[model samples]
Target: KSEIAHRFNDLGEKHFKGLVLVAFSQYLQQCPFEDHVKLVNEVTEFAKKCAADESAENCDKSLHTLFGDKLCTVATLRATYGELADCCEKQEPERNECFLTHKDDHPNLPKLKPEPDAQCAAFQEDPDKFLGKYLYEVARRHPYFYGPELLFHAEEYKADFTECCPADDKLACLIPKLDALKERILLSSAKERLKCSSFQNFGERAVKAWSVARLSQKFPKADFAEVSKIVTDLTKVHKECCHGDLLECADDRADLAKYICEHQDSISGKLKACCDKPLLQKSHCIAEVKEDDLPSDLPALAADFAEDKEICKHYKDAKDVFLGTFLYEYSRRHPDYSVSLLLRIAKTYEATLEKCCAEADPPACYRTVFDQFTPLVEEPKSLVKKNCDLFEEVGEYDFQNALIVRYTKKAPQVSTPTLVEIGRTLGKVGSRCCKLPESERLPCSENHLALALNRLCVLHEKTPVSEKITKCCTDSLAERRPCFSALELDEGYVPKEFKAETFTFHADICTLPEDEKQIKKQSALAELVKHKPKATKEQLKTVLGNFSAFVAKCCGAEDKEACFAEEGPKLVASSQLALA
Candidate 1:
């Protein structure tokens, strides 16, 4: 029994010491637990009472000697004496007999009720008050916790729990408390007054919370609608106040256009209000509006257009064209505004042009007006020049060298190859002026043929000629050599000092030859052909034939030598026969 008492004492000392340490540490740490402070005080008092209790020997003393045990044991002994004291104190019946009698008299004792801790009892009664006091102590001790309203909102968790657990009966009791918390959150002044940049973060969080609450089916629909309305209002306010600062330095008006388009559905009224402001009316605000979705009253709104003469004058022609097209399409669909209105607007624009240019040269002014408005009008040809006349009057030089660059970029649907072909045909008509005089005829009687060759060579020299020109020269010479001799003249008309040796020709200047030496010769011939104009068709034929025959032989033709020998002589002989 003494050993049992010693064991109990040891266990109480160890457990109580641990509890005291934990409570004291929690107090020092400023724990927000509702009963932490009271627990710390209770453990301190218990430790002091235990320390003051100094009875007999540590283990051999009766259980009543220990502070906590003394109380418990005395209570238990009172209950036991009520049941069995008579049997134990009775006259000296045998000690064993008396003990058995006492045991027999007492039935099994009833179970005692578990005792409640005083600190926990105090906490449950008014948890909010206790938690508030604890938080106030923490904040008062650490003054840095209070700076901005936002920081205060974050640091104060007491309000959150109180609002979440108002009547702590069951979990369902938290629903109303949560609703009240959200209402208070919605009414928060700080959120409403936040700047655009600051509200962006808060807006995302609010949307997320709103989404979660809505998903839970616990949120009131009216509350959800109210939150959405608030968000819509805030968005409008942000755009109205900060849009200029946000968009002032943007690279393109399209950036602002995109922003406006994205938020247009929610902020349409606010945007319209901003547009109506006298100061902002002249801005690019109109440009930001989605023209496709313009309201039915937009044409009526055009009445205001007449007031801003400067804006109207600057964009009048373009606006008129865009509106004319838009109204024409709209009238077709709705049968309200008529095509006559569009035609009237177009005529009015033409009349304005006529009045402005009355003093200018009639033809030049008409041409200028026609050029400017052709792109704007739907029927460009109806009021402009005929196609063939326009092409001729514009001139190939101006069309190719000046107008084509601009027009091609503006409308790339025009075929580039067709344009190039038109240019080449115009160049051929100009070639007639380059013909050589009849008196400068070759020995050949074919004066026209000789003249054509001289003109082709001159054009070849004048143009920034390439391999295509070389092929043209070669083919023309090959087919016309027989007629070259028709140009009747002196037999020695071929100028001896004409530098014919320096002139060379190639049949295929664009491709490489099969033989390396022949390829080099062909390259040299191309360079020579680039410089000389006196080389006759006969001389060129001979060189090209030799080069072609050499390549054919190198490619392993069956009659290798015969290939060059026959074709090379034929090329030269054919030219000589033309002289007869």
Candidate 2:
């Protein structure tokens, strides 16, 4: 018999309490198979008797407490017994059957020792090696439990474990072995790999592979082959995806080319579709048909258009009919010069429009001139500013008007001090404006005055009231000095009056008795006396008390003498006497 069996006999027929039964059941759960069955059967028989005895409330209480507050029906007990039986089979099968047959009666139970198998024996001999193999088995059985991919390299575990346990020790070795198993499982089941056929034939494949290799060198541990193949496939499919739109644009360009080649009279109309009207006018058809037919002096005429505003105006009016063909021919031979000349003419037209039309209408005309000529000019900002001013005038505001105006409006130029002062005054005026009228005052108004005075007293004690009030006013007005006087005598504004002598008088009299105010006034002079010798004595006592307590608490003193003798009193007295 073991210690547990002897304890069971000691507790015999005591009508096991619920806590005892529960403890017994838990013991059976962890016990070796041979002992588990007999113990569990003993608990079940005790629980059955507890359920049957009505007078013994403890018996009834024990039954509910052992199992649950509810009655333990046959079905519940059977289920519990079944669970126990399964556990016994795992621990020791032979003893489990003996308990099942004699569950209703208390019978002498046999003693049985535990028998651990090969895996258990391995664990007992060396836990580090057993743990490593156990972890490996778990990893192998469940590959997807690891990350990045279902499969990985098995050597990754070895590398990882080396980092986890950098030293040779029982615990350190076991730590790496545990992580190694998980790594093994992850490597075995990894599914991520580059799909090769996504790329074109070997030549394109070679280029992509090279790109991948280059990219891989830039990144640590990056799978470049996978990235390169994806890039190549996406690039190859881009043209095919937009093939329909490309075909439509090509067909349109071809049709325009054919029309220009076949019908020379229709060249302007066909070229207009492909290029702007300006470009069409400078095309081959206009140049070949009209250049020689125009006056030999047409170049001189265009030069007049550049220098003379009136001639440019007249040319613009009849441009499409009289000199249109000649101008188009000239423009074709000198397209760049023709564009420059056209821009110059456009500017002349804009100047004429500004002189003739209202201010609003000239902006449109100036914009046209700007779009045509400014890019060719030297000082673009000045030119654009001049043009913009032609239609809209900028104005300056007076000081008072600018002060109250919205911030978005142009601010009046003023000295910094003056601006700050104006801001301060405005803030003061706003605060004054928010005060409620006198009719809204609460009754018992003297209380409010007293409260305000009390707060002011506290402020005066902690601060120089005059300076603080001035600072508050200045900060509120953004450092505006003129706003300082605005803090004076406003309705509901608390006024603080401070005087050093008055403060001292009030503080001196505040300690006066109800009937001895006169005596306190006389005693005010007594505060000047000094108690140097008593003060020194008190200071020495404080130092000695602290030193003694330190010695008592930390230096193992059994009593006050021990504490004083153990350097506490000696150190304190030496310092005090030296000071004296």
Question: TM-score of each candidate?
Answer: 0.16, 0.14
Q: When superposed on Cα atoms, how far off is each prediction in RMSD?
A: 41.4, 37.8
Residue-pair clashes per prediction, in order, are 8, 8
| For model 2, the run of ten residues with the poorest summed lDDT | 191-200
In model 1, the clashing pairs are: 444-485, 444-487, 445-485, 445-486, 445-487, 445-488, 446-486, 446-487
Query: For model 2, how does the per-residue alpha-carbon lDDT over 375-441 read when each residue is reduced to its tens digit?
Result: 4333322322342232123221111112222110111222222233333323222222223232211
Candidate maximizing lDDT: 1
lDDT of 1 at 111: 21
Worst 10 residues of 1 by lDDT: 242-251
